[PDB]
Design a protein around this ligand. Sequence first.
Ligand code: A2H
Ligand code: A2H
Lengths: 274, 274
Amino acid sequence: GPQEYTLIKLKIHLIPEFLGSIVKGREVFVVCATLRPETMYGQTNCWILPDGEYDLVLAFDQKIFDKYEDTMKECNTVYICSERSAYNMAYQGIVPLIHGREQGVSDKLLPRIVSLGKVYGEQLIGTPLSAPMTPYSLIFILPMFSISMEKGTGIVTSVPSDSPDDYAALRDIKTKPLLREKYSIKDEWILDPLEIIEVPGFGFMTAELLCNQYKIQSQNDSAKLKQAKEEIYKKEFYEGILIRGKYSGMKICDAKELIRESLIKDGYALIYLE
Amino acid sequence: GPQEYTLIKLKIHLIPEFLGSIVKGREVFVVCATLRPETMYGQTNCWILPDGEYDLVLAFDQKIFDKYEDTMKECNTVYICSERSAYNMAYQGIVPLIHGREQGVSDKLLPRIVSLGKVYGEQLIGTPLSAPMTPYSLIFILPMFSISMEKGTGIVTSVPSDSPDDYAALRDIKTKPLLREKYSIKDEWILDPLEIIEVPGFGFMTAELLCNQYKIQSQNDSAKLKQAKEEIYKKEFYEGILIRGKYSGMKICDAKELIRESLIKDGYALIYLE
Ligand SMILES: CCOc1ccc(Cl)c2c1[B@-]1(O[C@@H]3[C@H](O1)[C@@H](COP(=O)([O-])[O-])O[C@H]3n1cnc3c(N)ncnc31)O[C@@H]2CN
Ligand SMILES: CCOc1ccc(Cl)c2c1[B@-]1(O[C@@H]3[C@H](O1)[C@@H](COP(=O)([O-])[O-])O[C@H]3n1cnc3c(N)ncnc31)O[C@@H]2CN
């Protein structure tokens, strides 16, 4: 590193009781790291690690505070993310830090994030979200088992048309009916992929082709997925043509940063480094 | 961590040729991390690791830039510090980042610091510096061998009256005449300690007493130094009375943050986390 990402804010549309008691009326967002802001037009769902443990982090609504109470008064926004990502967010001014009282005495200043609580990925499966740019009104949180808690926020947005991982993990849900009974996954949470990008070689549903081309059978086949992902990434950046949005018609390489800046302008996204 | 520090900017008063060719007319500062902003009244010298390798980092004069040339135009300030500290500075907005061209292709953004070059601590020994708050007009860079390159910036300010390390390392220079011949250390670079803080138990030159009390013989006796340092730190914060500056008369615990904020206001210091 360091590597640069776009942090995508997915707004919880209906906050459940178990969070509502802790967040007390604040806006809550699930926050995902992506390398591909231009693909937000094709989001079908959101991915979380079922046994991942995530923080409920107090965030700026968009200086290190001395009082917990003043931060709590001044921030009306919570981000669900890995503790680890929250610290990176803090260094970079995205969430507040306070001078913590949890250890030591007043002769040292120990900056800490304000974490209201802890939440397991499992508990969030089924949560409705307003996401930017996708035509779907609401998309839903679903389990992905390939998620590393040591990268990004541990939360990942799903664009199955142009991500081999996302295609593979949604297919595992679509086929394996034990998986759906287990996590109590309703049918209406599983949304259809969307055509968003033309790749002149492969057409408009490039992730499925590549998953067939590498003979990928589930989300777990990581060595092959890695090869699919590296191929799709470069070919789509240089040769992919957007068929959605303001920059419809343009190549990804020419539109990507413009799309990213409009998401940032509109409050859907932030620049993030780790 | 994370731990909070004050970054002290020590301005090079006479920039030598070997740096002048690389920095090309820019203001240069040597940057030190301290836990004790209130002790800047007693600075006698600055400490560097002789075989430490430091960056010449482009800094804001006080958004990730796409062009090296625009950063170079917009920044007239260089900070000498460890590469590692510079990255922390970058995350925290203290020095610019650029989208680097050193590896890969334009499909990924790789934020990098702008390092003009490399410099060994040895090469800086004898450099004259304007430091804040000390009565001395100029203080000088000298070698300290206990410095860890994995902490702070690898550069440390020297307050021998109230730091056991600083007292011990200056004494090693004062006594050991081979050490002075080796690094070519002139006499006029070795400045006398200054009384700055009364500790009701020990008086006004508390570091020397403690070095005697722990029977500390050189800067290398780290296990004992650790005990001296932990004792002096807490006793001075809670019981130490300043005899210098605007808050002369006051206890350190009441003056410390006020002093720190005035250094920040006046452009001598910055808040720094690692
Ligand atoms: C690798 C190509 O990634 C692609 C390719 C196509 C598309 Cl359409 C996308 C992405 B990408 O998914 C996120 C993020 O961008 C990408 C970050 O990859 P890097 O190795 O951590 O640098 O991996 C995914 N990611 C982020 N955090 C993750 C985590 N904790 N665990 C597993 N995967 C994660 O976003 C879109 C929609 N998913
Ligand atoms: C430990 C008490 O430190 C004292 C005690 C008294 C006084 Cl008057 C001072 C400090 B203190 O010296 C710096 C800095 O503050 C302190 C940081 O200690 P922590 O363990 O890295 O958190 O250690 C020192 N330090 C910073 N970076 C260092 C490094 N890379 N290597 C060795 N020591 C370093 O500042 C003043 C003037 N020197």
